[PDB]
Amino acid sequence: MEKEFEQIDKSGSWAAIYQDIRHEASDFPCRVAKLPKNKNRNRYRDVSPFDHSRIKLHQEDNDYINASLIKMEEAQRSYILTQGPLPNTCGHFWEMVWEQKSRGVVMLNRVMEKGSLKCAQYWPQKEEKEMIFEDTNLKLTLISEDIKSYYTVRQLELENLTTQETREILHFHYTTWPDFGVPESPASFLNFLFKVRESGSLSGEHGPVVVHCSAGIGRSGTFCLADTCLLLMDKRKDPSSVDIKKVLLEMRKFRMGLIQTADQLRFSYLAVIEGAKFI
Numbered sequence: 280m281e282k283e284f285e286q287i288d289k290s291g292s293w294a295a296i297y298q299d300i301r302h303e304a305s306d307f308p309c310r311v312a313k314l315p316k317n318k319n320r321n322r323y324r325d326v327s328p329f330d331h332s333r334i335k336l337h338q339e340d341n342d343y344i345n346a347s348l349i350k351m352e353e354a355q356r357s358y359i360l361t362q363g364p365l366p367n368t369c370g371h372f373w374e375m376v377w378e379q380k381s382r383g384v385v386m387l388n389r390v391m392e393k394g395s396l397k398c399a400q401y402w403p404q405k406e407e408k409e410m411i412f413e414d415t416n417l418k419l420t421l422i423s424e425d426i427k428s429y430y431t432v433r434q435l436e437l438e439n440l441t442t443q444e445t446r447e448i449l450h451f452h453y454t455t456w457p458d459f460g461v462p463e464s465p466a467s468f469l470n471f472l473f474k475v476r477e478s479g480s481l482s483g484e485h486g487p488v489v490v491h492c493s494a495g496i497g498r499s500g501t502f503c504l505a506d507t508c509l510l511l512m513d514k515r516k517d518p519s520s521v522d523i524k525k526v527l528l529e530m531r532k533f534r535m536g537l538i539q540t541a542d543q544l545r546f547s548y549l550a551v552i553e554g555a556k557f558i
């Protein structure tokens with residue numbers, strides 16, 4: 280892989296490899312996402328979950344949320360990739376976390392970037408100002424947060440107000456992705472991924488981790504792609520048999536558009552190459 284990377288870099292053919300992925304990517308129907316009644320549940324009209332892999336909400340109301348289950352069979356990991364919640368879908372977002380039994384939420388954007396809103400403020404910033412989602416009957420309380428220079432980990436308490444059951448949700452927030460482009464070095468991003476892993480949030484004991492950025496396909500795709508490739512490299516007898524392009528095309532059977540630019544593709548390669556050396 281590190282030779283294929285150096286050759287793609289020497290040849291300058293990241294854009295070509297990336298356009299090949301786009302051309303080969305699966306196309307499945309997104310009928311439900313495009314229903315008129317779901318217009319205000321989609322942050323971007325061009326980014327929709329496929330019907331076959333969308334997450335369905337369970338309460339007696341519209342079951343639609345812009346979220347997809349990515350189930351990587353060989354790597355034996357699942358992820359939920361979703362858009363940054365909208366002001367009217369934060370209750371649905373936490374309903375999904377509850378119903379899918381997720382332990383961790385991975386956020387790869389700041390709520391505002393370059394002075395534009397990428398995502399609703401869907402968790403409480405102050406302990407004493409908890410959030411109640413009256414539509415889905417959930418309460419969300421900030422218990423503590425561990426703010427580091429490049430990411431923050433928050434301990435949130437999510438309470439189902441119907442049953443009074445509570446769960447601890449870990450919010451892993453990568454706060455330093457650049458305004459433009461991708462990180463120059465994958466070190467921070469890998470350290471962040473390894474902290475999510477260390478938490479147990481990605482274990483099969485829990486529901487799938489919920490990963491989002493603004494549309495839930497670009498930075499989020501890099502996170503899940505890197506994580507899955509690194510899993511495959513540990514499992515296979517020949518770890519250089521792991522073909523990142525093939526893994527990405529497999530992930531794109533579950534959600535469209537994962538990895539949004541040739542720079543993100545190169546970054547994913549770089550993260551996998553560097554992450555494998557660490558492990």
Ligand SMILES: [Cl-]
Nearest residue numbers: 388389390391
């Ligand atoms: Cl933020």
Ligand SMILES: [Cl-]
Nearest residue numbers: 476477481510
């Ligand atoms: Cl792991």
Ligand SMILES: [Cl-]
Nearest residue numbers: 520521522525
């Ligand atoms: Cl492969």
Ligand SMILES: [Cl-]
Nearest residue numbers: 301536537539
């Ligand atoms: Cl695309």
